[PDB]
CSV table of C-alpha atoms in Angstrom, one decimal:
chain,number,residue,atom,x,y,z
A,1,UNK,CA,-48.3,-0.8,-34.7
A,2,UNK,CA,-49.9,-3.4,-37.0
A,3,UNK,CA,-49.5,-6.7,-38.8
A,4,UNK,CA,-48.8,-6.9,-42.5
A,5,UNK,CA,-50.1,-9.6,-44.8
A,6,UNK,CA,-48.7,-9.4,-48.3
A,7,UNK,CA,-49.0,-11.3,-51.5
A,8,UNK,CA,-46.5,-11.0,-54.4
A,9,UNK,CA,-46.6,-12.5,-57.9
A,10,UNK,CA,-43.4,-14.0,-59.2
A,11,UNK,CA,-41.0,-12.0,-61.4
A,12,UNK,CA,-42.4,-12.1,-64.9
A,13,UNK,CA,-45.2,-14.6,-65.6
A,14,UNK,CA,-44.6,-17.7,-63.5
A,15,UNK,CA,-42.0,-19.0,-61.0
A,16,UNK,CA,-38.8,-20.2,-62.8
A,17,UNK,CA,-36.6,-22.7,-60.8
A,18,UNK,CA,-33.6,-21.9,-63.0
A,19,UNK,CA,-33.2,-18.6,-61.4
A,20,UNK,CA,-32.4,-18.5,-57.7
A,21,UNK,CA,-35.2,-17.8,-55.2
A,22,UNK,CA,-34.0,-14.2,-54.5
A,23,UNK,CA,-34.2,-13.4,-58.3
A,24,UNK,CA,-37.8,-14.4,-58.5
A,25,UNK,CA,-38.7,-11.9,-55.7
A,26,UNK,CA,-38.7,-8.2,-56.5
A,27,UNK,CA,-37.8,-7.2,-52.9
A,28,UNK,CA,-34.4,-5.9,-51.8
A,29,UNK,CA,-32.8,-8.0,-49.0
A,30,UNK,CA,-33.4,-5.2,-46.4
A,31,UNK,CA,-37.1,-5.4,-47.0
A,32,UNK,CA,-37.1,-9.2,-47.6
A,33,UNK,CA,-35.4,-9.8,-44.2
A,34,UNK,CA,-38.2,-8.2,-42.2
A,35,UNK,CA,-40.9,-10.7,-43.2
A,36,UNK,CA,-41.3,-13.4,-40.6
A,37,UNK,CA,-42.6,-16.0,-43.1
A,38,UNK,CA,-42.4,-16.1,-46.9
A,39,UNK,CA,-44.5,-18.9,-48.4
A,40,UNK,CA,-43.4,-20.3,-51.8
A,41,UNK,CA,-46.7,-21.6,-53.1
A,42,UNK,CA,-46.0,-23.7,-56.2
A,43,UNK,CA,-48.5,-25.2,-58.6
A,44,UNK,CA,-47.8,-28.8,-59.5
A,45,UNK,CA,-49.5,-31.0,-62.1
A,46,UNK,CA,-49.8,-34.1,-60.0
A,47,UNK,CA,-53.3,-35.6,-60.2
A,48,UNK,CA,-52.8,-37.2,-56.8
A,49,UNK,CA,-53.4,-33.8,-55.4
A,50,UNK,CA,-55.1,-32.1,-58.3
A,51,UNK,CA,-58.1,-34.5,-58.2
A,52,UNK,CA,-58.5,-34.1,-54.4
A,53,UNK,CA,-58.5,-30.3,-54.9
A,54,UNK,CA,-61.0,-30.7,-57.8
A,55,UNK,CA,-63.4,-32.6,-55.5
A,56,UNK,CA,-63.1,-30.0,-52.8
A,57,UNK,CA,-63.9,-27.2,-55.3
A,58,UNK,CA,-66.7,-29.1,-57.1
A,59,UNK,CA,-68.5,-30.1,-53.9
A,60,UNK,CA,-69.4,-26.5,-53.0
A,61,UNK,CA,-71.6,-25.0,-55.8
A,62,UNK,CA,-74.8,-27.2,-55.4
A,63,UNK,CA,-77.6,-25.5,-53.6
A,64,UNK,CA,-65.5,-24.9,-35.9
A,65,UNK,CA,-67.8,-22.1,-37.0
A,66,UNK,CA,-66.7,-18.5,-37.4
A,67,UNK,CA,-68.4,-17.5,-34.2
A,68,UNK,CA,-66.4,-20.2,-32.3
A,69,UNK,CA,-63.2,-19.2,-34.1
A,70,UNK,CA,-63.5,-15.5,-33.3
A,71,UNK,CA,-64.5,-16.3,-29.8
A,72,UNK,CA,-61.5,-18.6,-29.5
A,73,UNK,CA,-59.1,-16.0,-31.0
A,74,UNK,CA,-60.5,-13.1,-29.0
A,75,UNK,CA,-60.1,-15.1,-25.8
A,76,UNK,CA,-56.5,-16.1,-26.5
A,77,UNK,CA,-55.3,-12.6,-27.3
A,78,UNK,CA,-56.9,-11.3,-24.1
A,79,UNK,CA,-55.8,-13.8,-21.5
A,80,UNK,CA,-52.8,-15.8,-22.8
A,81,UNK,CA,-49.3,-14.3,-22.2
A,82,UNK,CA,-46.7,-17.1,-22.7
A,83,UNK,CA,-43.2,-16.9,-21.3
A,84,UNK,CA,-40.3,-18.7,-22.9
A,85,UNK,CA,-38.8,-21.4,-20.7
A,86,UNK,CA,-35.1,-22.1,-20.1
A,87,UNK,CA,-35.2,-25.4,-22.0
A,88,UNK,CA,-36.8,-23.8,-25.1
A,89,UNK,CA,-34.1,-21.1,-25.1
A,90,UNK,CA,-31.3,-23.5,-26.3
A,91,UNK,CA,-33.4,-24.6,-29.4
A,92,UNK,CA,-33.7,-21.1,-30.7
A,93,UNK,CA,-29.9,-20.6,-30.5
A,94,UNK,CA,-29.0,-23.9,-32.2
A,95,UNK,CA,-31.6,-23.4,-35.0
A,96,UNK,CA,-30.3,-20.0,-36.0
A,97,UNK,CA,-26.7,-21.1,-35.8
A,98,UNK,CA,-27.3,-24.1,-38.1
A,99,UNK,CA,-29.3,-21.8,-40.4
A,100,UNK,CA,-26.5,-19.3,-40.4
A,101,UNK,CA,-23.9,-21.9,-40.9
A,102,UNK,CA,-25.1,-22.6,-44.5
A,103,UNK,CA,-23.0,-19.9,-46.0
A,104,UNK,CA,-29.4,-14.6,-45.9
A,105,UNK,CA,-29.9,-15.6,-42.3
A,106,UNK,CA,-30.3,-12.1,-40.8
A,107,UNK,CA,-31.2,-11.7,-37.2
A,108,UNK,CA,-34.6,-10.5,-38.2
A,109,UNK,CA,-35.5,-14.1,-38.8
A,110,UNK,CA,-34.4,-15.1,-35.3
A,111,UNK,CA,-37.0,-12.8,-33.7
A,112,UNK,CA,-39.4,-14.2,-36.3
B,1,UNK,CA,-43.4,-27.6,-77.0
B,2,UNK,CA,-43.7,-23.8,-77.8
B,3,UNK,CA,-47.2,-24.8,-78.8
B,4,UNK,CA,-49.7,-23.9,-76.0
B,5,UNK,CA,-51.4,-20.6,-75.3
B,6,UNK,CA,-49.8,-20.3,-71.8
B,7,UNK,CA,-50.9,-23.4,-70.0
B,8,UNK,CA,-54.3,-24.1,-68.3
B,9,UNK,CA,-54.8,-22.9,-64.8
B,10,UNK,CA,-57.5,-23.6,-62.2
B,11,UNK,CA,-59.2,-20.5,-63.7
B,12,UNK,CA,-59.9,-22.8,-66.7
B,13,UNK,CA,-61.8,-25.1,-64.4
B,14,UNK,CA,-64.1,-22.3,-63.2
B,15,UNK,CA,-64.2,-21.2,-66.8
B,16,UNK,CA,-65.9,-24.5,-67.6
B,17,UNK,CA,-68.3,-24.0,-64.7
B,18,UNK,CA,-69.4,-20.5,-65.5
B,19,UNK,CA,-69.9,-21.2,-69.2
B,20,UNK,CA,-71.9,-24.3,-68.5
B,21,UNK,CA,-74.1,-22.3,-66.0
B,22,UNK,CA,-74.4,-19.6,-68.6
B,23,UNK,CA,-75.3,-21.9,-71.5
B,24,UNK,CA,-77.9,-23.8,-69.5
B,25,UNK,CA,-79.3,-20.5,-68.1
B,26,UNK,CA,-79.8,-19.2,-71.7
B,27,UNK,CA,-82.2,-22.1,-72.4
B,28,UNK,CA,-84.2,-21.4,-69.2
B,29,UNK,CA,-82.9,-24.8,-67.9
B,30,UNK,CA,-82.7,-25.2,-64.1
B,31,UNK,CA,-80.2,-28.0,-64.4
B,32,UNK,CA,-76.9,-28.5,-66.4
B,33,UNK,CA,-75.9,-31.7,-68.2
B,34,UNK,CA,-73.1,-33.0,-70.4
B,35,UNK,CA,-74.7,-31.5,-73.5
B,36,UNK,CA,-73.6,-28.1,-72.1
B,37,UNK,CA,-70.5,-29.0,-70.1
B,38,UNK,CA,-69.0,-30.4,-73.3
B,39,UNK,CA,-70.0,-27.2,-75.1
B,40,UNK,CA,-68.3,-25.2,-72.4
B,41,UNK,CA,-65.2,-27.4,-72.8
B,42,UNK,CA,-65.6,-26.9,-76.6
B,43,UNK,CA,-65.3,-23.1,-76.3
B,44,UNK,CA,-62.1,-23.2,-74.3
B,45,UNK,CA,-60.6,-25.4,-77.0
B,46,UNK,CA,-61.9,-23.9,-80.2
B,47,UNK,CA,-60.5,-20.5,-79.3
B,48,UNK,CA,-57.0,-21.7,-79.7
B,49,UNK,CA,-57.7,-23.3,-83.1
B,50,UNK,CA,-57.0,-20.1,-85.1
B,51,UNK,CA,-53.3,-20.4,-84.3
B,52,UNK,CA,-53.1,-23.8,-86.1
B,53,UNK,CA,-54.8,-22.9,-89.3
B,54,UNK,CA,-56.9,-54.9,-92.2
B,55,UNK,CA,-53.7,-56.9,-91.7
B,56,UNK,CA,-52.5,-54.2,-89.3
B,57,UNK,CA,-55.8,-54.6,-87.3
B,58,UNK,CA,-54.9,-58.2,-86.8
B,59,UNK,CA,-51.1,-57.7,-86.3
B,60,UNK,CA,-51.8,-55.2,-83.5
B,61,UNK,CA,-53.5,-57.8,-81.4
B,62,UNK,CA,-50.5,-60.1,-82.0
B,63,UNK,CA,-48.1,-57.4,-80.9
B,64,UNK,CA,-50.2,-56.7,-77.8
B,65,UNK,CA,-50.0,-60.4,-77.0
B,66,UNK,CA,-46.2,-60.4,-77.7
B,67,UNK,CA,-46.1,-57.7,-74.9
B,68,UNK,CA,-48.4,-59.6,-72.6
B,69,UNK,CA,-46.8,-63.1,-72.9
B,70,UNK,CA,-44.0,-62.7,-75.4
B,71,UNK,CA,-43.8,-66.3,-76.4
B,72,UNK,CA,-42.4,-66.6,-79.9
B,73,UNK,CA,-44.1,-69.9,-80.9
B,74,UNK,CA,-45.3,-71.0,-84.3
B,75,UNK,CA,-48.6,-72.5,-83.1
B,76,UNK,CA,-51.2,-70.1,-81.8
B,77,UNK,CA,-54.3,-70.6,-79.7
B,78,UNK,CA,-54.9,-67.1,-78.2
B,79,UNK,CA,-54.5,-65.3,-81.6
B,80,UNK,CA,-57.0,-67.5,-83.4
B,81,UNK,CA,-59.6,-67.1,-80.7
B,82,UNK,CA,-59.3,-63.3,-80.3
B,83,UNK,CA,-59.2,-62.6,-84.0
B,84,UNK,CA,-62.3,-64.7,-84.5
B,85,UNK,CA,-64.0,-62.9,-81.6
B,86,UNK,CA,-63.1,-59.6,-83.4
B,87,UNK,CA,-65.3,-60.7,-86.3
B,88,UNK,CA,-62.6,-61.9,-88.8
B,89,UNK,CA,-62.7,-65.1,-90.8
B,90,UNK,CA,-59.7,-67.4,-90.3
B,91,UNK,CA,-58.9,-67.2,-94.1
B,92,UNK,CA,-58.0,-63.6,-93.5
B,93,UNK,CA,-56.0,-64.6,-90.4
B,94,UNK,CA,-54.2,-67.3,-92.4
B,95,UNK,CA,-53.3,-64.8,-95.1
B,96,UNK,CA,-52.2,-62.4,-92.4
B,97,UNK,CA,-49.9,-65.0,-90.7
B,98,UNK,CA,-48.6,-66.2,-94.1
B,99,UNK,CA,-47.6,-62.6,-95.0
B,100,UNK,CA,-45.8,-62.0,-91.7
B,101,UNK,CA,-44.1,-65.4,-92.0
B,102,UNK,CA,-42.4,-63.9,-95.0
B,103,UNK,CA,-42.2,-60.4,-93.6
B,104,UNK,CA,-39.4,-61.1,-91.1
B,105,UNK,CA,-41.7,-62.0,-88.2
């Protein structure tokens, strides 16, 4: 029993929007359905976000804290046991139905 | 364009940083300036080079003004001022205007 964090390079050299999303991923659908979240991280060339990224990188090589974060995380995993309410039940049903109605919406994504 | 070496990534940015740090550190310098940052940028540009082995000066100002205001008049007040400020003598400008008067302008 464990959690898996995985990183995968795109098929070939870089992501190609001409091919579908499933053809840029080297995973068969049975494996690809299990992951709760797949993040498509795309590299743009827009300076409106590149310059801000550049400042964040460049401000770090001249000359909550982790203890609070781990204390926060270790507390939540130990004491917090949420229970899904009746009202929140309907939203899960409708979200999956709408996602399924666009026809790769396996039921593994519903438990996700 | 089928002309690059495979684009430039954020790794190129840190490439500039490390080269600049390395170049300055070789000269025992404790600080890095443009004289080495440009040199770092030079190396990431020279490497690709092996693959690849006054009437106009006056008229350009007129064309720029024809974009800024676009008035197709025959008398001019902005052109004479700017050309004079550029260091020309009005005899050169008079010859320039005379030529373009014949040259379909």
